[PDB]
Every structure is written in C-alpha cells, then in structure tokens.
Amino acid sequence: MGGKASEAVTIAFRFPHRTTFLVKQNVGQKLNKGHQTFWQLVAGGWLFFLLINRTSFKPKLAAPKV
Amino acid sequence: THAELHLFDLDEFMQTYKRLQTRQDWLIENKCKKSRLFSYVAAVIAFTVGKSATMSDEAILAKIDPYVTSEVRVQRGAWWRSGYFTKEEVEMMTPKGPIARYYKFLLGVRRFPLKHGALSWACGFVPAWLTFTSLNHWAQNRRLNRYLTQESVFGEMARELVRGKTADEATTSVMARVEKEILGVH
Amino acid sequence: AAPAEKPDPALDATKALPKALEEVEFFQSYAVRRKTGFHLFNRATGSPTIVGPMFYNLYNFVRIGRVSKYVCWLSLPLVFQRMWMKNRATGMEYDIDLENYAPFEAKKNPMHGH
Amino acid sequence: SSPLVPVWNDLRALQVFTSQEYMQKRGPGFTNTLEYKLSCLNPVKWYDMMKVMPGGKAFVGTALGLALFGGWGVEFVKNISVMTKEKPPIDWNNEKLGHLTRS
Amino acid sequence: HRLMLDEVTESYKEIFYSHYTGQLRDVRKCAHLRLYDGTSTVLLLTNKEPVELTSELLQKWNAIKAAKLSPEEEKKARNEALIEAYKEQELHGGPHVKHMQGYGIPADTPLLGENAKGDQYTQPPESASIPLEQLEWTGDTVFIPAEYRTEMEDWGRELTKL
Amino acid sequence: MLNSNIYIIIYGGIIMYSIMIIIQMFLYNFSNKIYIEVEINKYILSKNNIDIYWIICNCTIIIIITTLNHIINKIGIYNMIEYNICYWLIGTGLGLYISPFIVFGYKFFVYIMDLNNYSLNIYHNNNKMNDIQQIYNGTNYNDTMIFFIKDINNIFTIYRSINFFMNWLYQMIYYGVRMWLVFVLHSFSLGSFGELITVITDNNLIFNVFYIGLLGLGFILYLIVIFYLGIQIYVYISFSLSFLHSTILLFLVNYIPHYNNKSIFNTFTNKSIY
Amino acid sequence: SPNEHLMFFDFSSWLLVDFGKRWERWVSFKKSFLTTTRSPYWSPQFFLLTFFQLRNSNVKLCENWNWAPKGDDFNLLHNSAAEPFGRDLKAHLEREAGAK
Amino acid sequence: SLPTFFLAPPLTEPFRARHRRKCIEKKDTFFQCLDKNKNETEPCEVEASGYSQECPDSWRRYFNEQRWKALELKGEVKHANLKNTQQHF
Amino acid sequence: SSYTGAALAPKSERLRLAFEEKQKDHQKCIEEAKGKGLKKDELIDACAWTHRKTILALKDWFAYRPPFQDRRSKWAEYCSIRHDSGSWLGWSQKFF
Amino acid sequence: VYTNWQSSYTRLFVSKPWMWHPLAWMTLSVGIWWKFGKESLCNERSFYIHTHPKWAPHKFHTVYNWSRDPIKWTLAEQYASIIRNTNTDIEAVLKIKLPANAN
Amino acid sequence: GELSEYVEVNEKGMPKPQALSLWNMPYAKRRALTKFARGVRWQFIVLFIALYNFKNRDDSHLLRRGAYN
Numbered sequence A: 001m002g003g004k005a006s007e008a009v010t011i012a013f014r015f016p017h018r019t020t021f022l023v024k025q026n027v028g029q030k031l032n033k034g035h036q037t038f039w040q041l042v043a044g045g046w047l048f049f050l051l052i053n054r055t056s057f058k059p060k061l062a063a064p065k066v
Numbered sequence B: 001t002h003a004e005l006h007l008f009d010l011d012e013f014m015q016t017y018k019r020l021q022t023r024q025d026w027l028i029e030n031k032c033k034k035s036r037l038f039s040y041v042a043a044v045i046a047f048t049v050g051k052s053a054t055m056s057d058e059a060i061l062a063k064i065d066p067y068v069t070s071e072v073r074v075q076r077g078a079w080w081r082s083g084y085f086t087k088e089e090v091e092m093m094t095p096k097g098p099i100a101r102y103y104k105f106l107l108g109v110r111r112f113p114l115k116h117g118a119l120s121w122a123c124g125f126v127p128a129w130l131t132f133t134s135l136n137h138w139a140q141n142r143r144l145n146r147y148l149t150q151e152s153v154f155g156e157m158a159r160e161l162v163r164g165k166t167a168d169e170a171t172t173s174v175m176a177r178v179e180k181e182i183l184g185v186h
Numbered sequence C: 001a002a003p004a005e006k007p008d009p010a011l012d013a014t015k016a017l018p019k020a021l022e023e024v025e026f027f028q029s030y031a032v033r034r035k036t037g038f039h040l041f042n043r044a045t046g047s048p049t050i051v052g053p054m055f056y057n058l059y060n061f062v063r064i065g066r067v068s069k070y071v072c073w074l075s076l077p078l079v080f081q082r083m084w085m086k087n088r089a090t091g092m093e094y095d096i097d098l099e100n101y102a103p104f105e106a107k108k109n110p111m112h113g114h
Numbered sequence D: 001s002s003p004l005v006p007v008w009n010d011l012r013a014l015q016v017f018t019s020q021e022y023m024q025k026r027g028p029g030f031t032n033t034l035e036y037k038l039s040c041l042n043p044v045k046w047y048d049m050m051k052v053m054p055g056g057k058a059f060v061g062t063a064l065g066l067a068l069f070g071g072w073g074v075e076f077v078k079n080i081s082v083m084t085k086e087k088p089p090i091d092w093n094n095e096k097l098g099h100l101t102r103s
Numbered sequence E: 001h002r003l004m005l006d007e008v009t010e011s012y013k014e015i016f017y018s019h020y021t022g023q024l025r026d027v028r029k030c031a032h033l034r035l036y037d038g039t040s041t042v043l044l045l046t047n048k049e050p051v052e053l054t055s056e057l058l059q060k061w062n063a064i065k066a067a068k069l070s071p072e073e074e075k076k077a078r079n080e081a082l083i084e085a086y087k088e089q090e091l092h093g094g095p096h097v098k099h100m101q102g103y104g105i106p107a108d109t110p111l112l113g114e115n116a117k118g119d120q121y122t123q124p125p126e127s128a129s130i131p132l133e134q135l136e137w138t139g140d141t142v143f144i145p146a147e148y149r150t151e152m153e154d155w156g157r158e159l160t161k162l
Numbered sequence F: 001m002l003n004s005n006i007y008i009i010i011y012g013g014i015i016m017y018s019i020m021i022i023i024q025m026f027l028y029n030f031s032n033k034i035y036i037e038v039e040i041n042k043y044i045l046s047k048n049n050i051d052i053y054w055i056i057c058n059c060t061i062i063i064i065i066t067t068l069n070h071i072i073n074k075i076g077i078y079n080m081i082e083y084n085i086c087y088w089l090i091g092t093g094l095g096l097y098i099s100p101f102i103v104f105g106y107k108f109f110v111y112i113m114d115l116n117n118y119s120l121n122i123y124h125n126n127n128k129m130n131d132i133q134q135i136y137n138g139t140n141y142n143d144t145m146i147f148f149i150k151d152i153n154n155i156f157t158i159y160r161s162i163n164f165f166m167n168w169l170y171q172m173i174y175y176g177v178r179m180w181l182v183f184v185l186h187s188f189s190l191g192s193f194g195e196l197i198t199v200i201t202d203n204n205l206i207f208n209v210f211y212i213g214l215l216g217l218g219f220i221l222y223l224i225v226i227f228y229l230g231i232q233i234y235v236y237i238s239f240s241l242s243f244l245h246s247t248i249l250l251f252l253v254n255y256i257p258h259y260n261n262k263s264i265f266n267t268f269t270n271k272s273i274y
Numbered sequence G: 001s002p003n004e005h006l007m008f009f010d011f012s013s014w015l016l017v018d019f020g021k022r023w024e025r026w027v028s029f030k031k032s033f034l035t036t037t038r039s040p041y042w043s044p045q046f047f048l049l050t051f052f053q054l055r056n057s058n059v060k061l062c063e064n065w066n067w068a069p070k071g072d073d074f075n076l077l078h079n080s081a082a083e084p085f086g087r088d089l090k091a092h093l094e095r096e097a098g099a100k
Numbered sequence H: 001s002l003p004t005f006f007l008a009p010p011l012t013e014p015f016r017a018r019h020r021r022k023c024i025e026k027k028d029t030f031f032q033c034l035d036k037n038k039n040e041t042e043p044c045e046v047e048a049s050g051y052s053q054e055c056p057d058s059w060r061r062y063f064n065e066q067r068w069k070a071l072e073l074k075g076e077v078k079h080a081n082l083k084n085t086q087q088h089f
Numbered sequence I: 001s002s003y004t005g006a007a008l009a010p011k012s013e014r015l016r017l018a019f020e021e022k023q024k025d026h027q028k029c030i031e032e033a034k035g036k037g038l039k040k041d042e043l044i045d046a047c048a049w050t051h052r053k054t055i056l057a058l059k060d061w062f063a064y065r066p067p068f069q070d071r072r073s074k075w076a077e078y079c080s081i082r083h084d085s086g087s088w089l090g091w092s093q094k095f096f
Numbered sequence J: 001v002y003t004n005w006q007s008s009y010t011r012l013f014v015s016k017p018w019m020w021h022p023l024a025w026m027t028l029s030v031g032i033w034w035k036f037g038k039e040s041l042c043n044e045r046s047f048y049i050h051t052h053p054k055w056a057p058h059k060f061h062t063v064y065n066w067s068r069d070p071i072k073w074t075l076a077e078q079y080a081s082i083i084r085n086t087n088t089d090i091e092a093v094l095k096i097k098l099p100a101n102a103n
Numbered sequence K: 001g002e003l004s005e006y007v008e009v010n011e012k013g014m015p016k017p018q019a020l021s022l023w024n025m026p027y028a029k030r031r032a033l034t035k036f037a038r039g040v041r042w043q044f045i046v047l048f049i050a051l052y053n054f055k056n057r058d059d060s061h062l063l064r065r066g067a068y069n
C-alpha cells in the first residue's frame, strides 16, 4: 500500500539548481521617482477603510427600558 | 476590548441552547463570519501595501522579473543565453495579477527602501495585524449590539450579561423564562 | 554517484559466531566435574539423557549467584500447594442446588451476560 | 507499485511533448491572440502561474486551493455515498421557537 | 572519510587546533579552507552568449578604464577584449559552469517530432543571427561562488544564529 | 446540571513503572549505539545524521528495555505492555514514523508542496517549451479546464504529493501489528500447551512429577523465549530501518562531486567590474 | 490462565473530569487575565485567548445542515414493515379477528 | 462538485422523470388489481414483479404506507400497522 | 426482513420522544422512592441516574437546531446531499 | 567554557531535533486520544462499552456484573454529589413539556 | 528504475520508450488523442462515479413532501 522513495524522484532532481547572484549596471533607473504624495493618500485610505468599518460597543442598548 | 468577554459566555449559552436560535441570530452570526473572512483579504492587502513601502527595486523585480519567478523550474543558463527566450516569450512568463501590476506601477513611485529582513516585513505585518484584529473586534462589537436589540432568548441573555451579572445567574434567569413562556412548564 | 569506497572490515560478519561460541564455551567450561560422587541415571537402553548431563553446569552457576539462589525457590512451595488443592477439588462434595443456581464459569448464564 | 508505470509514463510523455510540438509549430504570435490577452485578466492563470513561483508560493497556492475549494471537495467525496441513500424529509425549522419579549 | 579533504588537513589543524600549540596562524591556511568549495566564476552577459571573466580580461578592462578614453574607443576596446576572451573560452571547452553539478548552460533547443527538419534536430536562438563582431557587454553579471560546502544555506538553523 | 459534561478516565500503575525504564538507560548506556551508527551511515549521508540516529537509539533502547522488563521484571504493566496494540502502534511505531519528518521535515515539506504543482519530470531537461508550459500554464500537462473540478483536484493532488510517503506508514502499522500478534499468539499457544499438559498430569499423578527437571525445562524455555523474542526485536528494528531507507531516505540522495578551486587568494567582486 | 497473563488489572482508580466545568474555569481565567492586565484587542494575548474560541463558536452556530450525520439520520438498520397486501394483511386481519 | 450539482441536473431531469412516470404507472396498476382481487397477491404476480422491479424500495415503502392509510379510510382494516414507518409531517 | 434506510422520525421528534421516555423512567424512580418513604436527600441518591439521563436527553434536544430553509438547502435537497448552508469554505471553515 | 548542555536547556532543545521528537510524539498521542479515544471511550455516554465482552474483554477481571452495576452506582453517587453542591431540584425536570418542530 | 512521472530523453530531445512506443503515428493523431487528455486519471473516475450516483440519486424525501404529485 502506498508508494516509496525508490519509486519516485529525489529532492535533488526536483530543486536541482544551485544559486547564482545576478548584478546589473546602474543606468539611472531608480532615479526621479514620482508620486511623492502616494503613501500619504494610501494611509488616508487605510484609515478611512478602518473608520467606515468601525463599530463602537454601545452597552446602553441593554439598559432596562422595560 | 470588552465585548468578547461577554460573548464567550453568550456563545456557550448559544451552543448549549442552539434550539432557541432564531433566523436573525443566524444572520448575525453569518455577518460576523463574512466580516471575519474579508478580514483575511484585508490583512493580505495591507501586508502587501505596507511591505511595498520599504522594498527596493530589486525586491520588486524579484516578483516581476521572470528571471526570479522562474528559479524553481528553469535553468539560470536559459536566461544567460541571449535569444533563448524571445521578448513575447519573456512577456508571457511575467506575472499578470493585480499585485504584479501594482508593483510595476510602484517601480516609478518614491518610497523608503530598507534592507530585506524583519523590518521590511514588520512594516506590512503591523498594518495587516491591526487591520485583522480591529476588524474582527468591531465585528464582535457589532454582533453584540445586534444581539442586544434582538427580541429573543439570546438577546435577553446578552442583555443580562451586559448589566454586569454572572454567567450562571443569567442562565438561570433566562431559563426560568424559557421554561414558562417557550416550553410551557407543567 | 561513483564514490569508490574501499571495503570496511568492521561491516563484515566474521566475529559474531566466534563470540557466541566463546560465550557457549565459557558456559560449558563450568560443566567440568570430577569422577568422585558422579552418578547419572541413563535411559533404559543405557544411553544418556539430554537434561541429565547438563544439570551440573546449571547448578554450578547457581552456586555463583548471590540473591537468586536464595529467592527463586520461594515460589516452589506454591507448586505443591496446587498439587494438594487440585486433589482436594477432584472429589469435593458440593450442594446440587448451588451448583445448578450458581455454576462457576458455565455457559448461557444470563446473569453473566450470555 | 504496479507494472503499468512505464505505460503511464509513455502516455504522459506523449501528451507533454505533443503540446510542446504544437507550441513550436504555431511559432510566435501567441501574445497577439485573444486567448493570451484574456488569460492575462484570468484569475485562474494568475493562481496557476503563482503556484510555481519561489518564496513559499507553492505552499500558498496549495493552502489557498485547500481553504477555498478543497473543503468543498472533501464534502463532495463524502457526499458520493449519500446521494444514493434513502434519507428522510428535512425537518425545516418552523421559525416559531426562540422569540421572547424583553424585560 | 567521506566529506573531509586530505590536503586541507594540516591547514585545518593549524586554524582550529592552534590553541593547543600556542603558535600563531597564517591567514593563507584559512584561505585553504576554500578548497572545500568549487571555483568561483563570474559570467558577463552579452548579446550573444555569456563569457567567463578571467584575470587577463579584467586586467585589460582596468587598463582601458585607466587610459580615460572616449566611449567610442572605450566600448570598442572592451568589446575587442570580450570577443578575444569568448574565443579563448570556446577553445578551452566552454565556461567552467557548463560542467558543474547544480549549474549549467542549456544547449540549443530541440525540435520535436515533425518540427525536426531532417538532420537539423535543433533550433538555435535569435542571437545566433547576430554576427560575433557585434559582441557587446549587456552590463549584466552573474557571480557563481560554487560554494558546495561553505554556502550559508547549508549552514543550518543553529550555525547561522551562532 | 446541563453544563456539566463528565468524562471518566481508569488510571493505574504508570509513574513508578515508567521511571525505571528511563533509570535503566544509564545502565544500558545505549549499547545499541554502534549498530544504529552502522545502519544510518549505510542508509544516508547528511549533516542531520546524528539527529535521526539519536532518535532511533532512544526508541530502540526503550523497546529493548521494555522487552527485557517484559521477560524478567514481571510486574503490572511490564507484562501487558508488549501484549498491547497501543504500545506497538503509538509507543514504538509512531516515533519511528515521525522521526524522518522531524529531522528532514523542511526538505520533505518543500518537496510535498512542490509536487502539488504536478508535472512530468524530464532528465536532461534542455527544452525551452517545458519552461514556458511550467511557468505560464503551471504544469507540463494540459491544465485546460481542470479548475472546473478544482475542489477535488487540490485534495487529490495533496495525496499525489504524499503517496510516496505512505508505504512508510503502512510498514510501521504492519510491523507493529506483527509484533503484537507474535507476542500474544506465542504466549497464548505456549500457555495453552502447558495447561493441557497439566490437565494430562493432574489426572494421572504418576506423571505429576518434575519429569524433565526443575531447571532443565525452565532453562530450555528461558533460552527459547529469549532467542525467539530477540530475533523478533532484531527483525522489527532491522526491517523498520531498511524500509525507512527504501521509503523515506532515498529522497535525500544528493551526491556532490568534489570540484577543485583555483581562485583561492583572489575573488572577483562587484567592485572588480563596477 | 494464559489470557489472565494477557490482562492488565493494575488499575488504581477512575479519574472523573467535568470538562464543561474545566472549560468554564479556563474561560474565566482567560477573562481575568485579560482584564487584570488591561490588554488591548490587538495584543497577541487577546488574540490567542479570544479569536479561536470565537471562531469555533461562530462556526458551530452558523452551521445549517440540511441532514444530520450519516449514522444518525439515515443509513440506519430498520426492520421491514408489514405490507398492506398478501400474507401480512391476512395476518393482521386474523389478529384483529382473534383478539375480537 | 460543480458539474455534478450545476450541469448534471438539467441533463438527468428527463431520464429520471421517465422512471418516475413508469413507477407511478406500475404502482397504480398493481394497487388497482389488488383492489380488484381483494388484496390478493396470487393472480397479479406480473404486476407485483413490475412494481418491485421498476419502483425502488424507498418509493415502495411510501406507497405501502399510503395504501395502509387508504385501507384504514375505506374501512377494510382499523389501526393499520405502522411499526417501522416514517412518522414525518 | 431488514433494510438500511432513512430514520423513521425526524431528529427533533426523536430527541423529544427520547426525553419523554427518560422523563417516564425518572418519574417511576421518584414515585417508587416516595412509596418507600425516602426524603429529599435519599431521593437524590436514588434517582440521580435517571435525572442525569433526562438532563442529557434535554441537552441533546437543546443542542440540535432544525435547519432553516433557503435556496442552498433546497438545492442540496434536490441534489440529495448533506450540505451546510452556513459555510463558505466547507471542511476548511473549521480552520477559518 | 559555555555550553547549553550545562547552562541553558532551552537552547539545547532548540538546537537538537532529536529533542523535539519526544515532544511531538507526546503531542500527537494526546491529540489522537482527544480526537478518537476521548468521546468514544471516556465520556459518560460512551463508558458502558467497557462492559462489552467483545470490545473490552475482562476489563473488570471478569465478565461485567450487570446485577451489581458498579458504573451506575459510582456515577450516581457522583451525580448526587453534584446535585447537592448545586442544590438543584430533582423533580424540576419532570415539569417540562418540549414542543415539536411542527410542519 | 521506472520511476513515477519520470521520463528519459535521447540526443534528439525525444522521450525514450520505457515500455511502449507511440511516436510512429503522425502528429495529427497524437494531437487528437492528447488534446483532451490531462495530468489527471483518478479524479475523472471518481467524477464518473459521482455522476452515476447523481443520476441514480434518491428522491424519496421529496416524494414524502409531495413534489411529484
């Protein structure tokens, strides 16, 4: 019942590739980055999403009105 | 930070006396479930967007560039041989999802890069953690508020617990009513 | 893949049987006995028994023990206890009514379950 | 294992290398077709090509598939021996029990 | 007996067991520990093929960088040295990486079934059309330390922490 | 009351009988250490050898200790413990089952989660279309309209990843049940023959004598019992480890040839070029 | 007996554990710990001590099974009922006649 | 799951409706002949075989309960045997 | 003969009748203890067994909610499959 | 000279998977009992199977004595102690009339 | 040998036959056979069993309610 390791490929056949570190010359690609006010608006949207989905616990609804 | 402590005993009561559950209580629980499930997706989105605010261009190209998204299946030599993969062929291998497109847009966006490690990860986990915890907390608060205005057995139990009463006393007080009005005691 | 390891003699099997035979020879060395006081009832044919000539070794080892040779015999009176009680029970007179009402380990007794 | 393993291996190789042969035959121009442009907007393709990515994305894809659809698959497997079985009518809740005035 | 090397033995002893002798250590005997690893290479990626970097090519590039020439001359000399090194390694038998376990350069892709045009069972890449005289460095590099025993991945959960 | 959910647990002689199993380990002092050293070095070569070795040693010596306590120190649990199936499945088999997953769990987990991305394994995979199929479509195979049945596919693929880890579980259960059956059935058969002999001799007191001898029969039965049970324990251990090899440890065969280094005293770097 | 040797009667007692009471006291300890520490909802303490319990309760309260499990609502052994024709009807009528 | 529960049913509808119609026909004919021959199962053996063959057991049980109730109504019996029968509502 | 098939009474009715049977078995113990002339403290030790059995039957009745009618449950009825119309994930909802 | 062997059991445990093995073993055995053996054997509703001669032969050193019923009277004493500690009315359960989920 | 989901390759990039050769037939026949095949065998069998049991599902619980009257 069930298979064996002898009946299957190894953990070295899968995942056979060792590591090679790539490097690239700097032409100036990571310069002149725009959207300087992006994260401000992102944080604003996050806080807005949290506020609309906010619900304060109102135990006064359990007051003995009857 | 106070509704869950009552909701524990209320949930125990509901699990025991689930026969006394109406349709509206079921809908309340389903709504809490919906909020809980959406909280996972909100946490994932917040994690991505937060960690992306501290990722260098290399950390993003690790997720866009098919040189890095192919390390499991493809030899690195297939990428060193120029012309092995064509431009359209390299294009179809790139990820097309919304996260990949967000990052592609984010290449040209100014951010605050950090070295790949625990801080770049925490800057996503903290917003995600707060989002998840706060959404679930407010969901439980909404659940309790909905139960309190519910004219049912569970609403009465929740009300009796919110007064500041003990679990056993509230169970007895509510079961004294259940035996009379609901079950029709002998 | 093609490591070319030389044979390791420690992985061979050329000492286990010699060692076991050394242990058995040490055991059998204590079976050496003097001619004086020797007696062994042979079979009716005149041939020796199996267990007979290998009692001196066992009891020569019992001689060397310290605790078992004075303790392991204390379970032996219990054998004679059984020998006596069995014969007591082979012919014990009992009440027919109690045997028919409360038979011991009899089948189809509903009070037991079956 | 069975002795039919090499048969299945031959058939697997057949389908794999025939699909590769088709991909070589049709040559470039696949990115201009509608199939590619629609798959670019298809979440199934996003998931399938994210599965094989590195960084634990195989675990992510497997666990996501489980959490989403594999639970329904477990239920489906459990329900194969339930469809043929005589079951009673569903005792639909009368939605009368539970209501109680507040006080 | 299966893992250690018999040539790094005395250096291993001098580096790790000199608190027994009390003698000073030579750093070169610690550099000898790199013999457990393979040969560290650097492939410069071109528009045609990757070329292995050598002391000669690096010396020539440093010389060109020191001469402070115009880029029309700088790039020309760099590409001349690059094609020279390409020919040199093609005569050597390709880069060292082609015949190293865990790394490798794929050959020309195969043509499957009816796509095979008689004897031409292969389909060379696009860059085969480019003439070799146009060999230009892409500005991209691939470092291959070939650390089969020294690499930090195989260290473990404990050695890294320590 | 309604809220009171009551459970009855059974409890017997556990503490003092389990303490001495461990206290004896200082006396045995891992006499089985060399055998398991030899076998582990036969079956695997890695940095994490000692880990699995220690595990097996502990497991094995405990078994051995219990066996001797089952043969000699006959009190309370030591008699039943080898006749119980829970001890042979959970007290011996589960530890040996989870030992490679606790030592090599990282690699096995990565392998298993990669095999959910099922694909045909090609030797000397110098193909280009294979890569595009594996990345774009996810697999070598045709995955067109398999999402239509994804609900089953996922779970089925999960089994497809662990199917080659399952015979280890089967062999563990099989040999635990084998040891249980062996001990129980042989003890029962031996006692049954003894009781039949006692019935023959009690009804015939001419034979109700120490007819073989006080020590002869006992010595012979001692030797028979110890020889048989030692053979069975050796079978259990050796076969468990051979099946561990043939089922779980052949995944981890990664032979790296030794490549000579040349650039020892100088290394090319990012600053050499840039 | 041999079977008597294959028996473990070295038991000492029966440990009785009211898991309901123990669960109640565990929940009470969790509430007391979270109140005394004045811990917020975003804390790992509050999360570990609240979220899984609330999740499991919501799951067990949201469940609306059309049918109960296999061996509780169907797949049950039932003696065959008497038919309204043939021999069963004749036996029923004969019973009615004999009784009356 | 998806094909079995969202594409199969419109395809299995008619094959099942025909079986239902045939079972109802055989049931009606069998119980009609039983009404004729005074609940005797000796002459109408062909219809009994058709009833047992076409209609399944779970349907046969409901039809037997219904005929018990009908016989209670028309006065052929009193206190019909409902020992092992579904007491739903 | 016999047959493997559906439960006769619904789950709610089954639990109700079980509670009624245990009610009877407890009332009989109580009446017998009263006939024997036992007090409250002795009556407790007498009929605590039947009391606990009644309480367990009541717990079973209270724990089971009969299902609510909706489109998913009706479609599962048509499909004749055991289905929870309160789960978006199925067996994995246990972990989410 | 510092060693976790003599100065920190935690770092020793962390640095040795063969120290994790017994803990995982223990956790797995307890989980097995919790999932399978807890409710089927140890619960009060499922404790009479120990009286079965097929599934629990001679759990009391003999066949179970049903005339005596030690389980019943032990558990009845314990339930009586619960009732006296809680001061519950024995006859309050008999005043209940449960409804039916009509229709 | 004969591993699962494994296949060797010759110098021409072609799969070597382990048991049976099927590379003599033209590409059109292979594409016809394999266009509808997948990397999945037992799921289709389980699906056909489920479809058989769905075609042969029980509807007594609907008969009791009167949906077929």
Ligand SMILES: CCCCCCCCCCCCO[C@@H]1O[C@H](CO)[C@@H](O[C@H]2O[C@H](CO)[C@@H](O)[C@H](O)[C@H]2O)[C@H](O)[C@H]1O
Pocket: B012, B015, F003, F005, G019, G020, G023, G056, J030
């Ligand atoms: C020393 C060996 C033994 C060690 C045992 C340690 C086990 C630790 C794991 C505890 C698991 C917690 O699991 C939890 O169990 C409790 C019962 O206790 C279940 O509780 C359930 O049953 C109890 C009573 O039986 C009800 O009162 C409760 O309302 C219900 O939810 C929870 O639903 C489950 O979440």
Ligand SMILES: COCCOCCOCCOc1ccc(C(C)(C)CC(C)(C)C)cc1
Pocket: C023, C024, C027, C028, C031, C053, C054, C057
């Ligand atoms: C740990 O291993 C040691 C076990 O060895 C046990 C050996 O048991 C056999 C010993 O029994 C014998 C057999 C023969 C003999 C003597 C009868 C050798 C033959 C003699 C004395 C006539 C020559 C003595 C003892």
